[PDB]
Amino acid sequence: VPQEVLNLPLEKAHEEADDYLDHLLDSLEELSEAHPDCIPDVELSHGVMTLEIPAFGTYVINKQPPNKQIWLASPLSGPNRFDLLNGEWVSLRNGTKLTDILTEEVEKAISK
Amino acid sequence: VPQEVLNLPLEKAHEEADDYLDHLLDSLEELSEAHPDCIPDVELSHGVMTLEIPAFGTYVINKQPPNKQIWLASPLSGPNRFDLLNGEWVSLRNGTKLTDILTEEVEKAISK
Amino acid sequence: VPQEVLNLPLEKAHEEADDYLDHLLDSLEELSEAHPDCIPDVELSHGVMTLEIPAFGTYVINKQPPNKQIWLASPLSGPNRFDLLNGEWVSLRNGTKLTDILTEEVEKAISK
Ligand SMILES: [Fe+2]
Ligand SMILES: [Fe+2]
Ligand SMILES: [Fe+2]
């Protein structure tokens, strides 16, 4: 029906998890320089980000069917699950920011 | 198995987004009278509500697969996403009520 | 690609609703002893828990596609819907704990 809509420069919105992972990647392979040799590889395959931190292990950040969308598999802090609260990604278990976590775990790996 | 259940006047529950859109429509095509000629059409196609406000443009309210269920496409305030908090629909971005928004945008369109 | 992952004792995570229902069942068929003859049966069919409380009726606890995952059908307090807040299951309508509800409804059935 509504002709007035489809004459706009329309676009489908992004998956809100997709927006974060893309932002995470470039803000991680820019951080893959300030490694001594300690955060060698970042790779976003196809909705799956893999991070290698040889001190801790292999990270897996994952885009997941609901019951809340972003999946953390940390070889240090274990698994966790995140969805939107007020625009940042938040743990279903305790309420901790996803960003805040790999902030610590990366800046510990660089330090140690 | 459990025979005691299926002798009740059973019914499948409604989609909680469906309950809102139905309530929104009649509470909008009742509001499509107090237009000068300024909020001409409301139409709920099949899970898609279309609102025409010629001042701003064509609105689209939409029922969306999870990562949170009701989708706002406002030609004035942009796009947004809503799910249940304590029984009212709330923006994933900032936390604003969906009802509270098209309250303003309609009562501005009538005013101006 | 990432060889370091798949040499771990890997396992797929559980459905967070599944973890609760399993915990609910054994913590209910242990409670199906301290009935006079008043909470006779508990049964978890296949993602569907059925509770018979002859005073009130037949309960149905249910695992549901998102727009929030655990479904309560109480013959006393009506229907409700639950998802994770800070690690416990919470009503979309009002914000009440799922655990807190069948706590009351069971310990009323034993009492009365
Ligand atoms: Fe892992
Ligand atoms: Fe639009
Ligand atoms: Fe029932």
Curated annotation (Swiss-Prot), chains A, B, C:
Transmembrane segments: none annotated. Changing residue 81 to A: Impairs cell growth and lowers aconitase activity. It comes from the Eukaryota. Changing residue 71 to A: Impairs cell growth, lowers aconitase activity and strongly decreases interaction with ISU1. Changing residue 70 to A: Impairs cell growth and lowers aconitase activity. This is Frataxin homolog, mitochondrial. The gene is YFH1. The chain holds residues 61 to 172 of 174 of the full protein.
